[PDB]
Design an enzyme around this catalytic site. Structure first.
Site, PDB file in Angstrom:
ATOM      1  N   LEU C  36      36.866  35.069  37.490  1.00  0.00           N
ATOM      2  CA  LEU C  36      36.770  35.753  38.635  1.00  0.00           C
ATOM      3  C   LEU C  36      35.259  35.117  39.362  1.00  0.00           C
ATOM      4  O   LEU C  36      34.579  34.715  38.505  1.00  0.00           O
ATOM      5  CB  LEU C  36      37.009  36.996  38.879  1.00  0.00           C
ATOM      6  CG  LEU C  36      38.147  37.758  38.537  1.00  0.00           C
ATOM      7  CD1 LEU C  36      38.040  39.153  38.490  1.00  0.00           C
ATOM      8  CD2 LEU C  36      39.309  37.100  39.367  1.00  0.00           C
ATOM      9  N   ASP C  37      35.088  35.281  40.744  1.00  0.00           N
ATOM     10  CA  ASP C  37      34.025  34.493  41.122  1.00  0.00           C
ATOM     11  C   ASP C  37      33.085  35.559  41.581  1.00  0.00           C
ATOM     12  O   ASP C  37      32.851  36.640  41.120  1.00  0.00           O
ATOM     13  CB  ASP C  37      34.608  33.933  42.680  1.00  0.00           C
ATOM     14  CG  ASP C  37      35.402  32.881  42.505  1.00  0.00           C
ATOM     15  OD1 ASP C  37      35.294  32.143  41.477  1.00  0.00           O
ATOM     16  OD2 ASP C  37      36.208  32.713  43.386  1.00  0.00           O
ATOM     17  N   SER C  38      31.834  35.189  42.452  1.00  0.00           N
ATOM     18  CA  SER C  38      31.062  36.121  42.854  1.00  0.00           C
ATOM     19  C   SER C  38      31.498  37.115  43.904  1.00  0.00           C
ATOM     20  O   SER C  38      31.066  38.292  43.584  1.00  0.00           O
ATOM     21  CB  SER C  38      29.702  35.155  43.311  1.00  0.00           C
ATOM     22  OG  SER C  38      30.376  34.574  44.620  1.00  0.00           O
TER      23      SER C  38
END
Ligand SMILES: CCCCC/C=C/C/C=C/C/C=C\C/C=C\CCCC(=O)O[C@H](COC(=O)CCCCCCCCCCCCCCCCC)COP(=O)(O)O[C@@H]1[C@H](O)[C@H](O)[C@@H](O)[C@H](O)[C@H]1O
Ligand SMILES: COC1=C(OC)C(=O)C(C/C=C(\C)CC/C=C(\C)CC/C=C(\C)CC/C=C(/C)CC/C=C(\C)CC/C=C(\C)CC/C=C(\C)CC/C=C(/C)CCC=C(C)C)=C(C)C1=O
Ligand SMILES: CCCCCCCCCCCCCCCCCC(=O)OC[C@H](COP(=O)(O)OCCN)OC(=O)CCCCCCCCCCCCCCCCC
Ligand SMILES: CCCCCCCCCCCCCCCCCC(=O)OC[C@H](COP(=O)(O)OCCN)OC(=O)CCCCCCCCCCCCCCCCC
Ligand SMILES: CCCCCCCCCCCCCCCCCC(=O)OC[C@H](COP(=O)(O)OCCN)OC(=O)CCCCCCCCCCCCCCCCC
Ligand SMILES: CCCCCCCCCCCCCCCCCC(=O)OC[C@H](COP(=O)(O)OCCN)OC(=O)CCCCCCCCCCCCCCCCC
Ligand SMILES: CCCCCCCCCCCC(=O)OC[C@H](COP(=O)(O)OCC[N+](C)(C)C)OC(=O)CCCCCCCCCCC
Ligand SMILES: CCCCCCCCCCCC(=O)OC[C@H](COP(=O)(O)OCC[N+](C)(C)C)OC(=O)CCCCCCCCCCC
Ligand SMILES: CCCCCCCCCCCC(=O)OC[C@H](COP(=O)(O)OCC[N+](C)(C)C)OC(=O)CCCCCCCCCCC
Ligand SMILES: CCCCCCCCCCCC(=O)OC[C@H](COP(=O)(O)OCC[N+](C)(C)C)OC(=O)CCCCCCCCCCC
Ligand code: SF4
Ligand code: SF4
Ligand code: SF4
Lengths: 123, 127, 77, 340, 190, 388, 61, 56, 140
Positions: C36-38
């Site tokens: 998952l990303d920021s």
């Protein structure tokens, strides 16, 4: 103007990038919690996850910006847009500025190649 | 059949007839932006519940015990000749027992709403 | 409780950028285990708190990194 | 059976006209106070203006907004209409000329003016808005708060008659009016009358509240013609109350000597002539009084609700308690109690 | 003297100190005299009697389509292109009305006609963006366009409110008897 | 947690003077926080002045603050006169003193009567607008149009008075002195008008300066300052008058000083009708304003100057100025940056009502909701000022 | 030269009225109160006399 | 912080010019459209602007 | 009936609103025509756009026009209200309320003289003479 508006923040400029990253993180959280309020408030036709993916996409626009100072003006503009959207000062006709392509298909004959752009000389 | 009851039957039929001539003769033609309450050309969210002042509710709670006295003075005013010199003093005492509860009310300033617009009473003591 | 962690994983399943819905272990890190990303971390934490009806402050939202910490957090109510 | 239906037809048609021309006369005199003409483009001298308003107003459509109960929205004009109109029975246009002569006509006149509060308050909940509801609260609280001193002025006057009949009061009044002993009572009954209709000396709702047009802002057509009729029926109805219990009802002078000059015998021309004199005296009382309402509208600014409640409960009502104590004591000191 | 600094001859004036407000006991009015004015509403009745005096006087209203209000010759309304004696169009296409117009209402195309005289092919005013400043009338050296005092020309479409050369020549035809009266009294003052 | 119910006084409201959106958060009836929104009338007049010459920029000023036209004309004309380094003639000074005061009479007339309507008095509205019609006749004589007059120009004045107006402004003044005593009768000693305006809108004298307040609101609060006495211009030194300045900062002393500036303005009109001299009404030279039409049809030089002052315009020396005068609303100024070209590089009006509406929520905390409206009428919001 | 302009009269105009013209009108307030008490008390005289007369009429009936 | 009346002015100088005032409560736009993208009194912004309004 | 009673909503917002308050003045009266400002669009027959229309108010002007009951007209007072006017080339202005509301009578004048506004009212009343609401249903 002693006291300020409800969801206001005194504008303050951070000299480190990680503090700006923390503030944009908190700001995405603030947009994302308020999307059911926006869908109720502006009486829109569609579903809440389209507002949420609009919020994600508008942060996807400005991800690879290097300059901290430009990141700072971009953050301040985004918080002003949040304060207008959450307080219900913007109306539904300017809230739907943000969704120009969802509301209606503009028509036939979308020019993609050079030839379809040429036959109408870019319209 | 007196002419008292033709009237109380007869005002409504006039009102029903004027409401009927409006419903029959004017167009109807509504839509969504026509519907909706008016506030100054701007829609807004209504808050589900709002706060109020205690004097607002206190006016009409307090209204009824004064109203019940004014209808209690109404039996006396019709029999004022019969109870000569005696029912007079009883009605005096009744009204005086009321008046001291009223001066309780006016001494407490119950119906007055204060203003929180204080002009900064406290002076400038320094250091 | 047992049913509640299944509800957390059932929320966490209904997203994208997860090519393995069977990779939701009770100690799954959001960035490391799930990719998952920021933005996706505070996307999914808001989607978690939406499921229950609770609200979370900022110091209890910035710290959540794994589903272990969400299931540790769950008993605020 | 033919005779009571033609009398109620003629009294209806005389009162329902006279509430229409009241509003014309109001725009006329308010114009000349402000040094401008009134309407003169609708009839030969501006008359049947109210009929132009009414015939257009019946042709506008009725809109019922989405937050509203539609029934309540249309039934509050009907109940305010009938309540402002049911009180026209009990007034006498002469000795025992009413539309129902009952032995207790003040108690009826006082119970119908109690029924008129609802069409304010109830109309606040139809189209429930929090900016409309609180304005209906302020209006209803003012309305009851001045109805109190209205009822009290009545009972002070019935101290002198001890009869709830109304033509009994006016026959009692032949020796002297009740305005000339009780002069401050005329002033405070006039201002309580101005309050009870919410006239614009004492208004806050139509102008100052968060609605631009009072509690009845969102309306059109029949729900506006019924409120408009009901307010001016309330004007001339509380004017009638002042006309019988405080000024002379149908009494102008003695007029026995003028009759003993003119007539010879009881005949229908004599009863017609006496009826014209009696209702002429009552009408000129009532017309001077509606002119006083329009005259006090012209000259003055309005009230804060704090000013209004501080006015009624703290100033006028203690003075009224002093009046309760002083007037039966004056009937007491001298040996004069009124007999049934 | 010499003043301090932060100090001019703008000292406080003689008497800038207030007097202390009077208490209730140091008042010339009695309590009965003052409270008679209180309970008998004195100045309210005075202001009532003012507007009662105004009921009995002459109103100001004039009846508009039968009686018009004031006119000075300087007044401005719709536009008109005048003509010379013995009929010549007066507009020598000098573009000075176009160059000065603060809201850009004028548009002109100009061509040399068959005589070799300089005239306008197209003259045009948008009356929806005209602001009635009268600079177009002040600027013309021939005095070709003027402002007629007509204000009664309200229309129902926008297309009607766009005035070409022909509508304005017909106006300067129609109002010429009147524009004589206007420029006999204005032209010295211009 | 004091939860506040929020409302607007939106646009469609009679007491909002048309354009004013006013978010008010109240708790019961007291206002705990106010927030004026503005921009519903804003048109970008200041972006447009930069693309027009100074003579073409002249109507942008009486479009804004549309109640008092000649004063807005006057502030821009005085700023350009200061930049141009020219001296207007003597008659042109006395004539803009006089039409700057019937503009003052008309402004206070509209303002006091619109305030008295917003509170509830109906008759002064119509009596005052009658006197306004009697003055709009004079504007129609002097300029062309009634409500918007381009009479006061940067060189001076547009043109001479009509032939018989000076005997007419006297005939009006003789009766106006009584027509304003009469409006004073049913407001000044009304107990309703008093009680509705006694401790409303109180401004302390030290807060009136930090807020940037001026004119009748600064002179409501004790401080003796007005520009036409302190830093005089346009032959106000030669004309004798006095100044009314209140003592308590309320709306009632802001009321009583308006009622006396009528008196002082009528005194100006009389002293300038008596002392009017002869001479030229525009500035001496034809390089900044046009020749007469008698001369330019005879003179080659003056035809050249006429044809150039309208195609191109006159040019202003490069510089910057802030020129402030006293509008009846208060101190109004203009800050203009001159390129050296014939278009202004930058203009900026300082609207007087901008600082007054910006000082609304400092004053209107804790007042009731009816008293949030009689305070609008004292700060005199005409909204051509506030947004533009 | 300046011919054809409007100029003031050579003697000047007459002075206008710019002072406040608000003269105090009315009787003294004690006069209005004394008149009020007199009008009232004469009314009470006639009213209580009529009440006693009506009582004697009720006796007769 | 010094002047109570300055902030509206500062904020006006925001919306037309984009100049920032650090340490300012309630900095946002005034006297333009709410969804307005751009800063008008600025030499790169054209006169008539970028957008227009009609009733669809 | 539609003429002799004639009720506009007082939308007027700028320069042209004072000129409307001269139609309320005692020299050019509007009460003598039957005109009164019911200041709520639920009761006004007609609307008067008297002043400019910026881009921030165009939904507000429409929402006020949306509400009025169905026999409704609108007159456009001023030159800023038809075709932009003095502010035609501006970023925040609507080039006339023709884009927003369907307008029946245009009153031109930048301060359109109270004479001319009243003349526009008489022109609208003439349009009400030939409306033919009941002849239309016979399908003339
Ligand atoms: C006269 C002297 C005394 C004065 C009396 C009061 C004045 C009365 C003057 C009244 C004149 C008639 C004005 C009424 C008028 O035109 O609306 C026209 C009728 O078109 C006629 O077919 C018109 C036929 C109307 C029938 C005549 C009724 C006479 C008035 C009786 C009172 C409207 O058509 P429309 O079908 O779309 O309207 C319908 C209908 O109005 C509603 O009931 C429906 O609910 C709605 O859906 C809507 O569609
Ligand atoms: C200050 O400006 C104002 C006024 O002065 C111009 C007003 O008059 C007013 C009041 C408005 C009015 C008097 C106009 C409304 C008049 C009407 C609707 C007339 C109604 C006529 C009727 C109900 C006719 C009744 C007759 C019958 C039923 C016939 C019987 C058989 C307001 C609100 C105002 O703001
Ligand atoms: C006085 C004379 C009596 C006149 C009464 C005549 C009633 C006729 C009006 C009507 O047909 O019903 C209207 C009513 C409107 O309510 P609705 O449309 O459902 O909701 C709108 C919310 N904005 O629609 C309804 O829901 C009906 C409610 C009333 C029930 C009466 C049914 C009328 C049947 C017509 C035949
Ligand atoms: C019933 C409605 C509520 C009660 C209202 C009572 C009003 C009233 O007091 O009526 C009095 C009147 C007769 O009373 P009285 O004073 O004795 O008349 C003397 C004649 N010389 O009464 C009358 O003259 C006529 C009575 C009118 C009310 C009769 C209605 C009967 C209700 C039946 C309900 C059916 C369901
Ligand atoms: C020795 C014997 C005893 C002598 C005394 C006699 C006692 C009996 C006299 C009773 C008569 C009472 C009349 C009503 C009195 C009202 C008192 C009043 O004026 O209101 C005072 C109130 C201000 O209250 P307050 O707080 O005390 O002010 C102090 C300021 N620091 O201010 C206000 O509330 C505003 C004023 C409101 C007044 C209502 C005006 C509305 C209509 C006026 C009616 C005019 C009638 C005209 C009719 C036609 C006339 C021909
Ligand atoms: C409550 C309100 C009650 C209604 C209004 C009441 C008005 C007051 C009535 C008073 C009667 C009156 O006119 O006053 C008498 C008047 C002067 O009164 P005064 O100077 O005080 O001396 C009286 C000594 N007998 O004496 C006169 O003016 C007589 C004048 C004669 C010469 C006229 C020329
Ligand atoms: C007694 C009380 C009623 C007296 C009023 C008469 C005025 C009048 O009858 O007016 C005459 C009317 C309409 O005339 P108009 O064209 O609008 O007036 C124009 C003149 N101006 C320009 C000066 C305004 O003509 C009619 O056919 C009306 C016939 C039905 C009469 C209904 C009477 C109801 C009671
Ligand atoms: C149609 C019948 C209307 C009756 C009036 C209503 C009830 C009375 C109210 C009392 C007011 C009053 O009349 O007081 C009388 C005073 C005038 O006295 P003064 O000049 O101040 O001298 C007093 C000097 N002292 C104090 C030394 C004695 O006020 C006025 O006249 C002002 C005009 C009001 C006119 C009202 C019409 C009556 C005609 C009076 C002509 C003198
Ligand atoms: C429809 C018929 C017309 C009615 C119009 C009303 C008339 C008003 C006349 C002005 C009176 C006035 O203003 O009197 C003012 C006087 C105050 O005088 P002062 O300032 O103290 O004088 C001081 C200087 N001296 C003494 C040297 C002159 O008030 C009062 O003490 C009591 C006020 C009671 C007024 C009751 C009037 C009753 C009218 C109701 C019928
Ligand atoms: C606090 C109140 C104090 C009152 C002091 C006044 C004393 C004056 C003396 C006159 C008495 C007189 O002589 O008048 C007597 C009158 C008339 O009676 P009659 O029919 O002619 O007598 C015939 C006797 N029979 C019937 C047996 C045959 O009767 C009254 O009731 C009027 C009294 C004057 C009114 C006083 C009211 C005071 C104002 C009160 C405000 C609330
Ligand atoms: S009308 Fe006048 S300014 Fe315009 S082109 Fe013709 S001569 Fe030139
Ligand atoms: S009056 Fe003014 S805006 Fe109109 S055409 Fe002439 S110069 Fe242009
Ligand atoms: S039309 Fe003219 S007077 Fe009216 S607001 Fe626009 S510019 Fe101002």
């Amino acid at each position: 103007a002693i006291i300020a508006t409800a969801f206001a923040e005194t504008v303050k400029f951070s000299g480190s990038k990680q503090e700006l990253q923390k503030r944009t993180l908190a700001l995405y959280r603030q947009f994302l919690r308020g999307a059911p309020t926006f869908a109720d408030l502006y009486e829109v036709q569609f579903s809440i996850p389209t507002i949420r993916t609009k919020i994600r996409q508008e942060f996807e626009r400005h991800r690879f910006v290097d300059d901290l100072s430009i990141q700072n003006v971009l953050y301040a503009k985004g918080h002003m847009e949040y304060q207008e959207c959450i307080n219900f000062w913007k109306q539904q006709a300017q809230f739907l500025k943000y969704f120009p392509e969802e509301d209606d298909i503009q028509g036939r004959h979308q020019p993609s190649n050079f030839v379809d752009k040429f036959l109408k000389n870019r319209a | 059949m007196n002419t008292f009851i033709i009237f109380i039957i007869l005002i409504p039929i006039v009102g029903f007839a004027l409401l009927a001539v409006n419903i029959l003769l004017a167009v109807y033609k509504p839509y969504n932006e026509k519907l909706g309450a008016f506030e100054c050309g701007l829609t807004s969210f209504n808050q589900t519940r709002l706060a109020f002042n205690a004097a607002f509710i206190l006016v009409a709670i307090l209204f009824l015990p004064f109203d019940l006295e004014i209808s209690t003075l109404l039996p006396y005013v019709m029999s004022i000749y019969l109870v000569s010199n005696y029912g007079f003093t009883i009605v005096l005492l009744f009204l005086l027992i009321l008046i001291i509860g009223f001066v309780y009310e006016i001494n407490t300033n119950a119906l007055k709403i204060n203003k929180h617009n204080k002009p900064n009473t406290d002076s400038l003591i320094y250091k | 409780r047992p049913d509640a962690e299944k509800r957390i994983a059932a929320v966490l399943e209904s997203f994208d950028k997860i090519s393995n819905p069977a990779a939701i272990t009770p100690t799954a890190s959001f960035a490391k285990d799930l990719n998952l990303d920021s933005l996706d971390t505070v996307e999914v934490v808001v989607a978690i708190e939406e499921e229950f009806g609770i609200e979370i402050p900022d110091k209890e939202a910035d710290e959540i990194k794994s589903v272990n910490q969400a299931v540790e957090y769950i008993l605020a109510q | 059976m033919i005779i009571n239906i033609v009398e109620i037809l003629i009294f209806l048609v005389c009162v329902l006209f006279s509430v229409a021309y009241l509003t014309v006369a109001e725009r006329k005199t308010l114009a000349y106070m402000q040094r401008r003409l009134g309407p003169n483009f609708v009839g030969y001298y501006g008359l049947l203006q109210a009929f132009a308003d009414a015939v257009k107003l019946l042709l506008k459509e009725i809109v019922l907004p989405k937050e509203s109960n539609y029934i309540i929205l249309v039934i509050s004009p009907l109940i305010t209409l009938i309540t402002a109109l049911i009180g026209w029975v009990v007034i006498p246009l002469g000795p025992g000329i009413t539309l129902g002569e009952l032995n207790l006509g003040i108690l009826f006149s006082l119970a119908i003016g109690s029924l008129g509060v609802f069409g304010s308050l109830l109309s606040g909940w139809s189209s429930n808005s929090k900016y409309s509801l609180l304005g209906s609260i302020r209006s209803t609280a003012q309305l009851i708060s001045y109805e109190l001193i209205l009822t009290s002025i009545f009972i002070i006057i019935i101290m002198f008659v001890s009869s709830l009949n109304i033509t009994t009061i006016i026959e009692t009044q032949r020796v002297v009016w009740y305005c000339i002993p009780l002069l401050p009572l005329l002033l405070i009954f006039f201002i309580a009358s101005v309050a009870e209709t919410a006239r614009p000396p004492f208004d806050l709702t139509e102008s100052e509240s968060e609605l631009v047009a009072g509690y009845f802002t969102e309306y059109s057509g029949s729900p506006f013609v019924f409120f408009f009729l009901a307010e001016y029926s309330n004007i001339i109805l509380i004017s009638a109350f002042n006309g019988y219990l405080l000024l002379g009802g149908y009494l102008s002078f003695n007029y026995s000597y003028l009759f003993n000059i003119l007539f010879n015998d009881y005949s229908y021309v004599s009863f017609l002539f006496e009826g014209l004199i009696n209702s002429s005296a009552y009408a000129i009382k009532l017309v001077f009084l509606m002119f006083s309402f329009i005259w006090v509208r012209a000259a003055f600014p309005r009230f804060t609700y704090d000013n209004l409640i501080n006015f009624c409960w703290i100033i006028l009502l203690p003075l009224l308690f002093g009046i309760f104590l002083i007037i039966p004591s004056t009937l007491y000191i001298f040996d004069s109690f009124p007999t049934l | 003297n010499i003043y301090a600094g932060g100090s001019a001859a703008a000292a406080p004036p003689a008497g800038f100190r207030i007097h202390r407000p009077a208490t209730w006991e140091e008042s010339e009015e009695g309590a009965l005299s003052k409270a008679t004015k209180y309970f008998l509403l004195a100045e309210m009745f005075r202001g009532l009697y003012v507007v009662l005096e105004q009921f009995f006087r002459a109103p100001y209203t004039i009846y508009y389509p039968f009686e018009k209000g004031p006119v000075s010759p300087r007044f401005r309304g719709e536009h008109a292109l005048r003509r010379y004696p013995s009929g010549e169009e007066r507009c020598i296409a000098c573009k000075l009305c176009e160059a000065i117009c603060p809201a850009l209402a004028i548009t002109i195309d100009a061509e040399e006609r068959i005589d070799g005289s300089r005239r306008t092919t197209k003259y045009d005013i948008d009356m929806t963006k005209c602001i009635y400043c009268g600079y177009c009338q002040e600027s013309c050296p021939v005095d070709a366009i003027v402002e007629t005092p007509n204000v009664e020309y309200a229309t129902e479409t926008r297309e009607e409110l766009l005035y070409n050369k022909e509508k304005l020549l017909a106006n300067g035809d129609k109002w010429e008897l009147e524009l004589q009266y206007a420029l006999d009294a204005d032209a010295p003052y211009r | 947690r004091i939860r506040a119910f929020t409302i607007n006084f939106g646009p469609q409201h009679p007491a909002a003077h048309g354009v004013l959106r006013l978010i008010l958060e109240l708790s019961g009836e007291e206002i705990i926080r106010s927030d004026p929104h503005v921009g519903l009338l804003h048109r970008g007049t200041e972006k447009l002045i930069e693309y027009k010459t100074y003579m073409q920029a002249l109507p942008y000023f009486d479009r804004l603050d549309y109640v008092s036209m000649m004063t807005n004309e006057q502030v821009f004309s005085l700023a350009v006169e200061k930049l141009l380094n020219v001296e207007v003639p003597l008659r042109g000074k006395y004539i803009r003193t006089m039409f700057g005061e019937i503009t003052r009479v008309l402004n206070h007339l509209m303002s006091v009567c619109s305030h008295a309507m917003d509170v509830g008095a109906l008759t002064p509205f119509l009596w005052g607008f009658e006197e306004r019609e009697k003055l709009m006749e004079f504007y129609e004589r002097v300029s062309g149009a009634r409500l918007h007059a381009a009479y006061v120009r940067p060189g001076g004045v547009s043109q001479d008075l009509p032939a018989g107006l000076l005997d007419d402004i006297y005939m009006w003044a003789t009766q106006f002195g009584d027509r304003l005593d009469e409006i004073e009768e049913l407001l000044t000693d009304n107990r309703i008008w008093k009680l509705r305006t006694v401790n409303i809108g109180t401004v302390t004298a030290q807060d009136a300066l930090n807020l940037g307040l001026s004119g009748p609101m600064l002179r409501g609060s004790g401080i003796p300052f007005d520009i036409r006495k302190n830093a005089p211009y346009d032959a106000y030194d030669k004309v004798d008058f006095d100044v009314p300045v209140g003592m308590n900062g309320d709306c009632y002393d802001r009321y009583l000083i308006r009622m006396a500036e009528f008196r002082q303005s009528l005194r100006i009109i009389e002293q300038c009708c008596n002392d009017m001299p002869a001479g030229a009404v525009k500035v001496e030279d034809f390089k900044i304003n046009s020749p007469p039409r008698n001369l330019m049809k005879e003179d080659m030089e003056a035809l050249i100057h006429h044809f150039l002052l309208y195609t191109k315009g006159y040019s202003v020396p490069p510089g910057e100025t802030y020129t402030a005068i006293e509008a009846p609303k208060g101190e109004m100024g203009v800050y203009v940056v001159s390129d050296g070209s014939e278009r202004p590089y930058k203009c900026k009006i300082r609207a007087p009502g901008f600082a007054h509406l910006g000082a609304f929520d400092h004053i209107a905390r804790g007042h009731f909701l009816p008293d949030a409206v009689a305070i609008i009428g004292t700060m005199d919001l005409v909204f051509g000022e506030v947004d533009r | 030269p300046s011919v054809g302009q409007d100029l003031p009269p050579v003697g000047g105009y007459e002075p206008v009225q710019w002072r406040r013209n608000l003269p105090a009108r009315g009787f003294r307030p004690l006069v209005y109160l004394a008149a009020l008490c007199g009008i009232c008390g004469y009314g009470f005289y006639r009213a209580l006399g009529g009440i006693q007369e009506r009582r004697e009429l009720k006796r007769e009936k | 912080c010094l002047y109570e009346g300055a902030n509206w002015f500062e904020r006006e100088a925001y919306d037309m010019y984009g100049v920032f005032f650090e340490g300012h409560p309630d900095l946002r736009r005034i006297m333009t459209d709410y969804g307005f993208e751009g800063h008008p009194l600025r030499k790169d912004f054209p006169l008539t602007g970028y957008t227009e309004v009609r009733w669809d | 009936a539609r003429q002799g009673s004639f009720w506009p909503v007082t939308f007027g917002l700028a320069c042209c609103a004072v000129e409307m308050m001269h139609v309320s003045a005692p020299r050019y009266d509007q009460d003598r025509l039957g005109i009164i400002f019911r200041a709520s669009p639920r009761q006004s027959d007609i609307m008067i756009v008297a002043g400019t229309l910026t881009n921030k108010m165009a939904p507000v002007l429409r929402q006020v026009y949306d509400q009025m009951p169905e026999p409704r007209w609108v007159i456009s007072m001023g030159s800023c209200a038809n075709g932009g006017g003095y502010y035609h080339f501006s970023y925040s202005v609507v080039r006339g309320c023709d884009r927003i509301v369907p307008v029946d009578v245009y009153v031109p004048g930048c301060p359109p003289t109270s004479e001319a506004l009243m003349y526009g009212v008489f022109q609208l009343q003439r349009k009400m003479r030939n409306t033919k609401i009941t002849r239309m249903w016979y399908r003339k």
